[PDB]
A paper describes a structure:
Aurora A kinase is one of the key regulators of mitotic events, including mitotic entry, centrosome maturation and spindle formation, as well as assisting in neuronal migration. Aurora A has attracted significant attention for the development of targeted agents for cancer because it is overexpressed in a wide range of tumors, including breast, colon, ovary and skin malignancies. We note that in Aurora kinase sequences a tryptophan residue, Trp277, is immediately following the DFG motif and displays a drastically different orientation whether Aurora A is in an active (DFG-in) or inactive (DFG-out) conformation. This Trp moiety is unique for the Aurora kinase family in the Ser/Thr kinome and its position is suggested to be important for tuning the substrate specificity.
AT9283 inhibits both Aurora A and B with an IC50 of 3 nM and has also entered several clinical trials. Interestingly, the crystal structure of Aurora A with AT9283 shows that this drug binds to the DFG-in, active conformation of the kinase. Our structure was obtained by co-crystalizing Aurora A with AT9283 and a monobody that binds to the same site as the natural allosteric activator TPX2. Binding of this monobody shifts Aurora A into an inactive conformation, with the DFG-loop in the out conformation. This new structure underscores the plasticity of Aurora A kinase and the ability of AT9283 to bind to a DFG-out state, in addition to the previously reported DFG-in state. Thus, our structural and kinetic data together support that AT9283 can bind to both DFG-in and DFG-out state of Aurora A, and emphasizes the need for caution when interpreting single X-ray structures. An extended model, where AT9283 can bind to both DFGin/out conformations, followed by a common induced-fit step can also not explain the experimental kinetic traces. These failures, together with the lack of a detectable conformational selection step, led to a new model in which both the DFG-in and DFG-out states can bind AT9283, but only AurAin:AT can undergo an induced-fit step. All data can be globally fit to this model and the overall KD calculated from the corresponding microscopic rate constants (using Equation 5) is in good agreement with the experimentally measured KD. The number of crystals for each structure is one for apo-Aurora A and Aurora A + AMPPCP and two crystals for Aurora A + Mb + AT9283.
Numbering used by the authors:
A (entry chain D): 127 to 278, 289 to 388
B (entry chain A): 127 to 277, 290 to 387
C (entry chain E): 6 to 93
D (entry chain B): 5 to 93
Write the structure that this text describes.
Amino acid sequence: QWALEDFEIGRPLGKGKFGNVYLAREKQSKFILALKVLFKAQLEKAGVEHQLRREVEIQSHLRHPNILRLYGYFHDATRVYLILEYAPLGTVYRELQKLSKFDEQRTATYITELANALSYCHSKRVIHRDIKPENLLLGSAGELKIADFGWSLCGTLDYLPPEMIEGRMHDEKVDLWSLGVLCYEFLVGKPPFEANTYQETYKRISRVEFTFPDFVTEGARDLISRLLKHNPSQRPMLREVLEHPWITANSS
Amino acid sequence: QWALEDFEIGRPLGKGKFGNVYLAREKQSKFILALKVLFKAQLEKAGVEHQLRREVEIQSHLRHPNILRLYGYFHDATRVYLILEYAPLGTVYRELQKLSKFDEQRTATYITELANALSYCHSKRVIHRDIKPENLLLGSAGELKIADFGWCGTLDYLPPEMIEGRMHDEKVDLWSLGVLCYEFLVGKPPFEANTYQETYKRISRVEFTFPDFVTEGARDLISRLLKHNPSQRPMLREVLEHPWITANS
Amino acid sequence: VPTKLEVVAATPTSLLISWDAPAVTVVHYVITYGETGGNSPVQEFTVPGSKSTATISGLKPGVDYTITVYAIDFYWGSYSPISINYRT
Amino acid sequence: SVPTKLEVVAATPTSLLISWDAPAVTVVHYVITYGETGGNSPVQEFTVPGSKSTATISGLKPGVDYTITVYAIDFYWGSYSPISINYRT
Ligand SMILES: O=C(Nc1c[nH]nc1-c1nc2cc(CN3CCOCC3)ccc2[nH]1)NC1CC1
Ligand SMILES: O=C(Nc1c[nH]nc1-c1nc2cc(CN3CCOCC3)ccc2[nH]1)NC1CC1
């Protein structure tokens, strides 16, 4: 059992319209923690309170180095508290918004870590993990941690394959399309299908309309292209992606 | 490029979750239609624009007699307008509120319309269409028309492979079809429980019962449609050729 | 949650309690009551989530009872109870 | 009419500065179209960042009247109902 009176809420770590995340620590042991606060009204109003309750049970029976941990949860009249692992270095979104581009190795390294988790998740039947930059955190040793615990030019459309946006059948092969999109984003600094309006982007995804700048190396240009394919079956396997020469060369 | 000054707004038809709907007529053509008006403020507070904007593009490519038509959309500063087909007979949710349940002739008929609408969606590779009483309208000739836009909850209509968090295919429509047939006959969701933990188990374990006034024909269909393993569920073509609906249509 | 829980009316044979709306969807309330202090295990009955009152019958006069009610959220379980003492 | 305050701030025989009240809403970018009013030659289009509230139009002939239509684009729901004004210079 958990309660709000067992945490020393330190300084905030994020303030948005969907919820707040404060720096906290266990009182008995002084163990640093991350407390994610969400409001039932917004969750109930959006129809996501179920999905949030679904992730809590799913993410409690699985552990992985590159997967943020959920150490419990509690609630009150209006709010819903989540006990999350702490990540000192922050989110890859902010670190990306500052540096804009990553090294050829940092990208190949991030892609290496994400691929391992997706295989660990795709094995347990846990298909589709949102791995957009906003849901990627950086730990003490500079390692990624997928943090899919609810909300947080374009939005979440830039990371979806044609199967999702069109409401068609999807499977574990959507994760590959996300790696290709995210990989393209670390090197170039922007999703490949990003446009000015929702419809414009929707058409570029469904039609697979994107282009590679000149500075994009040849190795990365072969992996990203092998993942961004309309047919989800033509895509590779998470094992083959790990064997790609460009990854094995620059990754770590 | 429609605009608010192109319609003759009139009697209100209802009050949705993110706004209200009105009844209007196309000025330049005198065509009647339903004009759903959703306040952006209520849309952005819950972040549901992309969920509806995505549904718009999906249904925009879908034009079936049993699927509500979306002729176009326009917006202003603080409101988003959806130009929807008109349904003079109201919403099926109102029928279940006035009647509490349907006769096997009305259910088998509605199940026959939906099985067709679902098969049309499968032809376009579109799956998982919400067909709860809320999103079902009644056209002019008693034609059931699906309306997926917005405005327990949907949990009751979710198959056992989606609450558990696993990959799903086109068979989720067979589940919701059987679930829907159960509500039209009984007037209640078959897996409606008190709490989430209880509602989850009953769906994951298929813990439902047939009242005394449920015939063997219907009981057999619902039994066939409500199979834990999606492979064990029937095919839409077989549903249409089921004895229980071939006689009650 | 419930935050308030008073006794609006009572009789030598039964009592009638009431509470406030928690500004949140509640599945249903669990009502437990018994002689405050400790004579034997307490009882437990449920009341729908839409109702804001209950009626416990079968209480002897002159017994400082302790009624406890805790709401249950559909997704997140039970709330923190709110107990109040009353002498029949 | 979004934008609302479509007006002419500055002008000259060569170029022309246009402005409009901030929409107080997230706009991706503005599309401006201008051409000889009354149904003359086709118009000319060019885009403007969604943060700016002004725009410059260069290369005009003095005297002719022009209909300057400004479209405000919303990411999700496309363009608003435009606002046009005639200007002679
Ligand atoms: O769940 C979240 N974040 C976290 C989960 N685990 N740990 C975090 C979090 N939030 C983090 C924020 C920062 C940077 N700030 C400045 C320096 O001191 C720490 C705070 C660094 C690391 C952070 N980690 N959501 C973030 C607020 C939007
Ligand atoms: O999608 C909606 N409406 C419609 C789209 N197309 N057609 C409708 C709609 N809504 C309808 C409602 C009624 C019955 N009521 C009593 C008589 O007049 C006022 C409403 C009848 C027909 C109706 N059609 N949502 C609002 C809550 C109903």
